[PDB]
Amino acid sequence: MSLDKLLERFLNYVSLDTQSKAGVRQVPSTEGQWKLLHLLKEQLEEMGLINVTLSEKGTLMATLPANVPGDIPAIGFISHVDTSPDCSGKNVNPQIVENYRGGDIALGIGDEVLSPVMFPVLHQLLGQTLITTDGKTLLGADDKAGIAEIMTALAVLQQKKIPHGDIRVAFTPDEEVGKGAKHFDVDAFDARWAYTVDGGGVGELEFENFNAASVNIKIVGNNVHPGTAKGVMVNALSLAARIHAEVPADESPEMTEGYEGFYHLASMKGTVERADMHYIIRDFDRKQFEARKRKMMEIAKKVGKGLHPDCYIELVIEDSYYNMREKVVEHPHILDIAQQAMRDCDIEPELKPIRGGTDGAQLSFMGLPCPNLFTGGYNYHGKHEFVTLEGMEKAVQVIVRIAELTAQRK
């Protein structure tokens, strides 16, 4: 491998404004993404890969064909070309700190700083080459570190003539708005299983995510002139506060970690006549997920007791996505090769649940079981995002090894 060429590749992708935007019917949601998609398409062709197709919805697929004879299962690696809408992805001006000495890093010239007081991980990254922002923007290691790594891995397999079956690659348009799997043509991708290279620090591997549902509450109250309100007026907001009061305050995103699920009130709007509440429900375990739904319904009936026919509480519950675990563990080889790969590269696998949704978790329920491989990056979606070059080198080495190890079993 070649650490300079890897960094340069990455810095070129990072330089392109490819930030997503919510509330957009078109996919991809923004123009900038097409520029990275198209650069990537040319790069894949130029790398020698075949069947390079960019769909009309911004999904880019390509194949590095089998190296050796034998019936090796086709595997995929997936990244997205967009950065989070939460912070600018435009004119990212990366800072390169060689041989990091475990102190505060100044982001640009200003009162913005990357500091181990705020981010203790840094204590553990002494002597690594850190790539940071300048305080004004995101970095976009999420997920262009992923892209640079997949691209480099492709090159390595060829230049180092490492035996491998068919390797499939896809680069998706709107992950940061959850549209990164919608138009994914799994038949065309033609892989048995896959990996998104879209995780965090060195060694992270993820095959679990939340089960999700929205719980939307419509409350109809009765509103008259407040002065004559006695024994007549029914305040929808007062019922709304009653509902919220019964919801386990300790089982909230603020107070919850690791594998522990939560209820969460995301938005609300109302008057005396009508209020609407938007809850989300999250649980890794499915029975609990359902138990959580049951709770909201119990709260709705309790609070609803006493209301004259003209007043009522109405709950609409709607599943959003499921825990991919089952569809992954269904096939021991997927996580076993991934972990063997890491272990071969002297990486200790760090199993970690996705406290949310991933592209892979959708793909998993589409015929394409798809866990998450690390990237080397930290502090995503903010101005304190960074990445180590060495983290990225290890992520290449793992993709390559997975490819290699898959060939041995075919």
- Which residues are designated catalytic? 82, 175
Per-residue string for binding with its own copies, 112-151, x by CB under 8 A? ----------------------------------------
CB of residue 264 vs its own copies: minimum separation in angstroms? 5
Does residue 308 interact with its own copies by CB under 8 A?
A: no
Does residue 74 interact with its own copies by CB under 8 A?
A: no
Cβ–Cβ < 8 Å for 165, 408: no
Instruction: List the single partner that 39 binds among its own copies, Zn ion, none, CB under 5 to 8 Å by kind.
Output: none
Strand order in the sheet with 50-54: 50-54, 60-64, 167-172, 75-80, 193-197, 372-373, 204-206, 350-351
Does residue 235 interact with its own copies by CB under 8 A?
A: yes
CB of residue 176 vs Zn ion: minimum separation in angstroms? 6
CA 409 to chain CA centroid, nearest Å:
30
Site for Zn ion in 122-151 (CB under 5 A): 142-143
Instruction: List the single partner that 198 binds among its own copies, Zn ion, none, CB under 5 to 8 Å by kind.
Output: Zn ion
Strands 75-80, 167-172: pairing kind = parallel
Per-residue string for binding with its own copies, 341-380, x by CB under 8 A? -------------xxx------------------------
9's CB contacts (< 8 A; 6+ apart) are 148, 151, 152
**Binding test (CB under 8 A) with its own copies, winner from 35, 264, 295, 410:** 264
CB-nearer residue toward its own copies: 264 or 295:
264
Strand order in the sheet with 312-321: 274-283, 211-220, 312-321
Strands 211-220, 193-197: pairing kind = unpaired
38 is in an annotated binding site: no
C-alpha span between 68 and 408 (Å, rounded): 10
CB-nearer residue toward Zn ion: 67 or 388:
388
CB-nearer residue toward Zn ion: 67 or 375:
375
CB-nearer residue toward its own copies: 189 or 284:
284
393 is in an annotated binding site: no
- The string of DSSP codes covering 341-354 is HHHHTT---EE--B
Cβ–Cβ < 8 Å for 149, 201: no
Phi then psi for 320, rounded to 5 degrees? -110, -50
C-alpha span between 172 and 195 (Å, rounded): 13
CB of residue 295 vs Zn ion: minimum separation in angstroms? 30
298 is in an annotated binding site: no
CB of residue 175 vs Zn ion: minimum separation in angstroms? 5
CB of residue 80 vs Zn ion: minimum separation in angstroms? 6
346 is in an annotated binding site: no
C-alpha span between 396 and 407 (Å, rounded): 17
Does residue 198 interact with Zn ion by CB under 5 A?
A: yes
**Binding test (CB under 8 A) with its own copies, winner from 70, 110, 226, 367:** 226
Cβ–Cβ < 8 Å for 1, 392: no
With CB under 8 A as the rule, give the number of residues binding its own copies: 40
Phi then psi for 186, rounded to 5 degrees? -60, -30
As annotated, the binding site for Zn(2+) includes: 80, 142, 176, 198, 381
Binding site for its own copies (CB under 8 A): 210, 225-235, 237-238, 241, 244-245, 249, 252-257, 262, 264-272, 280, 282, 354-356, 381
Q: Note the residues at the interface with Zn ion (CB under 5 A).
A: 142-143, 198
